[PDB]
């Protein structure tokens, strides 16, 4: 997270950190006791044994409940940056209680509304190309960017209705490398997307691009 602040305990009860090879890698969202929603790019094709999930902590290294993965299901039509979600099944159940809860999904057919304030969180880089990855969770609030503008920025073909965009025109607030798969929520903390891709991080006029929960609910609902 670029241009963010320290998350507080309980801000995202459902957020998980996803390590790979014992190192920071991605974020995700706990949907229920044995299921995490993350970005397909975080897990597609990779050895599933390299991953570990941690829930119930502001730290990605300590505290909470951990689990290995039983299975990975990438969206059936994942293609390029498109349909960039995967459903993970957990070998250790993660009961709700305390700072653990489950995500509330955006309504089916919904699209985030341009100009509305969204909050994204993760343990990714704090600058584009940055060396340091935060131990404690960061968050940042950015406006949704209209898809028409996002298409002006990246090309019409590059932004589909399975994606939405968020960021500030003059740059400086965004998700970044290591935040992929983690949540973006609306002002009521409803899960509207997962961090997906972008042309660097926090660049002026290149919005962050997010996998859209509202558009992907039929894959999410069926396997969650």
From Swiss-Prot:
**For this chain's UniProt record, which GO biological process terms are given?**
proteolysis
Where does it reside? Secreted
Q: Where is this site: Required for specificity?
A: 174
The enzyme class is hydrolase
Give the enzyme's EC designation. Answer: 3.4.21.4
* UniProt GO molecular function: serine-type endopeptidase activity
**This protein's superkingdom?**
Eukaryota
What residues does the Peptidase S1 domain cover?
Answer: 1-224
Entry GO CC: extracellular region
Principal subcellular localisation of the protein: secreted
Query: Where are the active-site residues found?
Result: 41, 84, 180
Q: What keywords tag this UniProt record? A: Disulfide bond, Hydrolase, Protease, Secreted, Serine protease, Signal, Zymogen
* Disulfide pairings: 26-42, 150-165, 176-201
Q: Which reaction does it catalyse?
A: Preferential cleavage: Arg-|-Xaa, Lys-|-Xaa
InterPro entries, per this entry?
A: Peptidase_S1, Peptidase_S1_PA, Peptidase_S1_PA_chymotrypsin, Peptidase_S1A, Trypsin_dom, TRYPSIN_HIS, TRYPSIN_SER
Similarity comment: Belongs to the peptidase S1 family.
Name of the protein in question? Trypsin
The organism is Fusarium oxysporum
